[PDB]
């Protein structure tokens, strides 16, 4: 008579393939995604202070284009510029526009 005793390990019917050092496709019992591949499509207003530029570039809010009067003296952690923004004051340019914009943003 006597007995038999077997050692073993689990398995699943729905394993997932990952890559390793010696084989690009090996099936394991479970895995997790390390790359975030999607957004919810909106910028959350918390916990950082968001300032929506709407029709105004940073430079335009700075200079004081009338439609940007609401922006006076406001602060932000992140200023958001919209592609729809436009100037509606006296036509202007800024030598090294990008730097001024940058230093103000910061």
């Amino acid at each position: 008579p006597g007995a038999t005793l077997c050692l073993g390990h689990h398995a699943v019917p729905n394993g997932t393939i990952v890559k390793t050092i010696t084989n690009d496709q090996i099936e394991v019992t479970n895995a997790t995604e390390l790359v975030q591949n999607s957004s919810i499509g909106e910028i959350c207003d918390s916990p950082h202070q968001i300032l929506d530029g709407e029709n105004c570039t940073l430079i335009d809010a700075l200079l004081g284009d009338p439609q940007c009067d609401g922006f006076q003296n406001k602060k932000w952690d992140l200023f958001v510029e919209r592609s729809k923004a436009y100037s509606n004051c006296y036509p202007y340019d800024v030598p090294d526009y990008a730097s001024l914009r940058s230093l103000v943003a910061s």
Partner: protein
């Protein structure tokens, strides 16, 4: 809503170490990589019946 990480596509959860949503980011964000997926094993090799 409340989210640490902002990108031009919108805010994203920041649980994962990497992301391929946008190279532009602000806040506590995963680092941008080119891969659309990287699967980390969290179990042993599967050897079915």
């Amino acid at each position: 809503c409340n989210s640490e990480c902002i990108t031009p596509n919108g805010s994203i959860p920041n649980d994962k170490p990497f992301q391929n949503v946008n190279r532009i980011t602000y806040g506590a964000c995963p680092r941008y990589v080119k891969q659309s997926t990287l699967k980390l094993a969290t179990g042993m090799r599967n050897v079915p019946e």
